[PDB]
Structures are given as structure tokens and as C-alpha cells.
Ligand binder design. Sequence first.
Ligand SMILES: [Mg+2]
Ligand SMILES: [Mg+2]
Ligand SMILES: [Mg+2]
Ligand SMILES: [Mg+2]
Ligand SMILES: [Mg+2]
Length: 146
Amino acid sequence: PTYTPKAGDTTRSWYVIDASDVVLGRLASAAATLLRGKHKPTFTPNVDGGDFVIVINADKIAVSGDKLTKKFAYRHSGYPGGLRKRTIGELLEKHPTRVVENAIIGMLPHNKLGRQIQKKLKVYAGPDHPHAAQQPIPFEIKQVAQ
RNA sequence: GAAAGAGUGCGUAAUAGCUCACUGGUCAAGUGAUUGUGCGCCGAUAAUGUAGCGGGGCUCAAGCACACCGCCGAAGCCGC
Ligand SMILES: [Mg+2]
Ligand SMILES: [Mg+2]
Ligand SMILES: [Mg+2]
Ligand SMILES: [Mg+2]
Ligand SMILES: [Mg+2]
């Protein structure tokens, strides 16, 4: 019948994605794609069998239009009147990384498996990362023509 | 006579003056006015928390209109 992975069937690859002058939504959508494992013919929605993704230069992300001043990130502290908002602007120089990862978390499934999947994401604001030991192969944001 | 309006606005409370509509000039090609529309702007404004895209995100469209090319999709139809 239909193939389902056994215990030692999942193999993990390390991708590094450069984020310099890339659209935030495009980068995050692709990273979510190859973080969930949608690019593998052995995909199965039950199993967490994606790949590791490093995002490099999360500072240099591109946000189009006029969202660096009028787009907000809202958090609520649970206390009455405990809502705070930070623009994309402030969030890009206070601590930038979460901006990129915020987008990716919004495109992974919001279940327990999504929590397991998140752990494979490594966002770095700098141009360099500490994971050179896993030989991360560079990944290009490609579109397949039709 | 070109240029002088029973004199256009300020202000002199009235005049005056500042000016203007209107002819002379050096300049160097456009310049001003409507009507039919396609998309947008403002008017815009409530009380637990974003809160009038389902979310992330989208103008490098993932928005809109017109053509075209595929595909997904039901217990519908077909196949056994
Ligand atoms: Mg007069
Ligand atoms: Mg004059
Ligand atoms: Mg949407
Ligand atoms: Mg069916
Ligand atoms: Mg039937």
C-alpha cells in the first residue's frame, strides 16, 4: 500500500538561505516550504520530516510598500490594557531576527508537530552562523516554470 | 488711442496709496477650459485585546479589468 516512513527513514539536510534584499513573505514562505518537507517525495503529513534551515542576513530583509512604519506586531500581556505594539521598523533594530522568524511561524501549522518543526529554524541577523560543521548548502529562491 | 474698468482686491472708515483686468517689450513651445469615463483620496467616528483579509504575509501582487492555458475540488457522474 501507500508508503509510510519507518523508524530510520528520515534524513535531514542543512540549507542556508541568504536574506539580503529578499521579500519577507517570499523568503518566509519558501523557508516554511523546505522546513515542513513539502519538497520531498516521501512527504507524509503525520511525520516531521523536513530539513534544517539557516537564514543568514535577517537584517537585510526587504519589506515592500510602506510597512516599515504602519505595520504592527501586537502582543498582549494578559493584564487589562496589556497590549503593546511594535512596528516592523522598531523590531528591525531592537532585535531583528524574530521579524523574519515571526513570518515563518505564521506559515507553519499551529499544532504540536509545528512546535517540533520550529526547532529546525536558525535565524541569524549577521552574515555568518556557527553551524559550519554541518556543511549547509546554499539555497536559492527558485520558481518552476509552466 | 494700445493702455485705462461708471474702475478688479487690500486698505485709506470718504479720498490717497498699494495693485489689478487691459497695449509696448528680451524670453522660447506649447498653454488654458470643459465632457465621458477606469481605478484611487478626504468626510470616517466607542468602550476586555490587534479586532471591517480566517492568519502569516502580499504592491518584486499573493490587488483590479480584459483574453487565454492548466490543474485541485463533493457521498454529483463514470470505472469494478
Ligand atoms: Mg476707479
Ligand atoms: Mg503689472
Ligand atoms: Mg489573505
Ligand atoms: Mg470523490
Ligand atoms: Mg451516486
